[PDB]
């Protein structure tokens, strides 16, 4: 009898006793673009009142919370759920098609069959974590000296490098690696070039950090990747 | 001891383990003789778990044996759920078997305790394999009435 | 339909083997009985049959496209005059 | 694009559904006695690769 909106108890307050109001037809569904009733309550004294933002047809076809839109089974954003878990196909993003899908899905879904069962949801969660753990575990000579000497003069089967003392992996990994070798200024990097250049407040920290040497390095777009292919022949 | 079950999907043939558990099969035999099972829904279908049915009301509760309310089961060690098709009975307590039964679709070694085993389906197993693929609502209940037309004992 | 039947080539090595093999161990129900047969739902053919399906369909389509194909100012007027000629020339 | 491009994108007007985000009216075939099952799910790779 237009009784309740579905809200999880994380954003329903830690009090088992709360009061809320409804304003019928108070907003257009942010997905259905449909006239829907609003519900306002207080999570806890001292913060701004919450309110429901999506209709009852949604957050049910999505099995989600009308206010926080965290999925009611796992508790992480429904967008990330449908992007990574990929349980069942979602709707479009354009206006007319999205509202058409919302209307027809609400119709065929109130006919009685449920579009969301949690058994397959947990199965897909375990499948995703399994795939994650699975993820966890003369032509070369001519493209070698073709341009290295050119740049070296301009601004400076097997190949073995030299070690000099002249005075997938994000950048924060570099940040928490060099912090014990001296203060950091900026870490400029590029995955394609695979070259990460750091700067310190003093050259003494740089030289003491570089002395730790015996995967590591010591001192256009495609134009910077010529020496990155040396990784294939390192 | 032999009972043919003219179910709605097809034909189920069952042989009763009179030699193993005599008391639990006599009621079934005389119950097929009376044949009040006509027009009884298979109210419960769980994929790869069971197909339960046998109640006149069709609400998943009730069903009177010849003893009238309930009887005492008899179990022995060599009975096991090692296969897919064992015909067993249904209960809701220590010794509370009623007129309904079910057919196994998978090894259930954890269910061989308070639960009696009294049948092995010799033919019509395909029918149960398809019963495992029946339209089911949120509860383990088929949407359309999965009645049994009629059953002869033979 | 009966033209298509006239262009059919049945009786491969499959049908006789299917008639003779599973009939020997017919403990219950016959392979040809269909009053209460269940397996006919799950008949998934082989590659050769589907291939001949596609070639027959393509040949028939090509056959259709093959057989299907100054009093006037334009080509439509021409087609209209030929229609007029078809209907009124008798009168 | 021949020499050096800024990756030109074609311009859409403001009031079209664009017919390129999903099926324009999104109607699925009715399911019948014979189960499709594998006929499309065994060959999702085909649905992408014939394309």
């Amino acid at each position: 009898d237009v009784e309740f909106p579905s809200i999880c108890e994380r954003c329903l307050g830690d009090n088992s006793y709360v009061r809320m109001t409804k304003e019928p037809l108070g907003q257009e569904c942010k997905i259905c673009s449909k006239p829907c009733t609003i519900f306002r309550w207080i999570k806890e004294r001292g913060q701004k009142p919450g309110k429901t933002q999506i209709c009852v047809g949604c957050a049910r076809y999505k099995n989600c919370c009308q206010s926080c839109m965290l999925d009611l089974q796992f508790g992480l954003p429904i967008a990330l759920r449908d992007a990574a878990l990929k349980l069942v196909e979602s709707g479009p993003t354009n206006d007319i098609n999205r509202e058409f899908f919302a209307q027809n899905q609400q119709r065929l879904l109130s006919n009685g069959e449920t579009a969301y069962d949690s058994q397959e949801a947990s199965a897909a969660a375990r499948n995703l974590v399994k795939k994650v753990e699975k993820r966890e575990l003369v032509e070369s000579k001519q493209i070698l000296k073709e341009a290295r000497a050119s740049d070296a003069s301009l601004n400076a089967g097997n190949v073995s490098l030299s070690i000099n003392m002249e005075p997938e992996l994000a950048d924060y990994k570099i940040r928490k690696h060099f912090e014990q070798y001296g203060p950091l200024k900026s870490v400029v990097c590029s995955h394609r070039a695979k070259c990460a250049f750091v700067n310190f407040k003093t050259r003494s920290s740089a030289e003491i950090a570089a002395a730790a040497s015996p995967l590591k390095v010591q001192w256009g777009p495609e134009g910077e990747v010529r020496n990155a292919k040396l990784a294939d022949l390192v | 001891a032999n009972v043919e079950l003219q179910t709605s999907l097809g034909k189920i043939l069952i042989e009763l383990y009179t030699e193993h558990a005599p008391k639990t099969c006599q009621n079934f035999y005389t119950l097929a003789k009376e044949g009040y099972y006509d027009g009884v829904i298979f109210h419960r279908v769980i994929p790869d778990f069971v197909i339960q049915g046998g109640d006149p009301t069709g609400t998943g509760r009730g069903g009177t044996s010849i003893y009238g309310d309930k009887f005492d089961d008899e179990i022995h060690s060599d009975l096991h759920h090692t296969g897919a098709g064992i015909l067993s009975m249904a209960n809701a307590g220590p010794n509370t078997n009623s007129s309904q039964f079910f057919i196994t679709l998978a090894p259930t070694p954890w269910l061989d305790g308070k639960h009696t085993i009294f049948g092995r389906v010799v033919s019509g197993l395909s029918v149960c394999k398809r019963m495992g693929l029946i339209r089911t609502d949120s509860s383990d209940r088929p949407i359309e009435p999965l009645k049994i037309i009629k059953a002869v004992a033979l | 339909y009966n033209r298509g039947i006239r262009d059919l080539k049945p009786d491969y090595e499959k049908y006789d083997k299917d008639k003779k093999e599973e009939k020997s161990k017919s403990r219950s129900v016959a392979l040809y009985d269909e009053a209460e047969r269940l397996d006919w739902v799950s008949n998934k053919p082989d590659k050769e049959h589907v291939e001949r399906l596609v070639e027959s369909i393509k040949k028939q389509d090509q056959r259709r496209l093959k057989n299907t194909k100054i009093t006037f100012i334009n080509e439509r007027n021409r087609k209209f005059n030929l229609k007029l000629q078809r209907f009124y020339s008798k009168y | 694009k021949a020499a050096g491009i800024n990756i030109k994108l074609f311009r859409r007007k403001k009031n079209e559904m664009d017919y390129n985000a999903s099926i324009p009216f999104e109607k699925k075939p009715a399911i019948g006695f014979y189960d499709t099952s594998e006929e499309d799910r065994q060959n999702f790779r085909e649905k992408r690769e014939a394309d």
Partner: peptide
């Protein structure tokens, strides 16, 4: 095995002895 009912239930032995419905 996770197929659910991806297809309609097969025809029924109707109560009027009709073989297939």
């Amino acid at each position: 095995r996770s197929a659910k009912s991806a297809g309609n239930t097969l025809a029924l032995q109707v109560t009027s002895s009709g073989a297939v419905d």
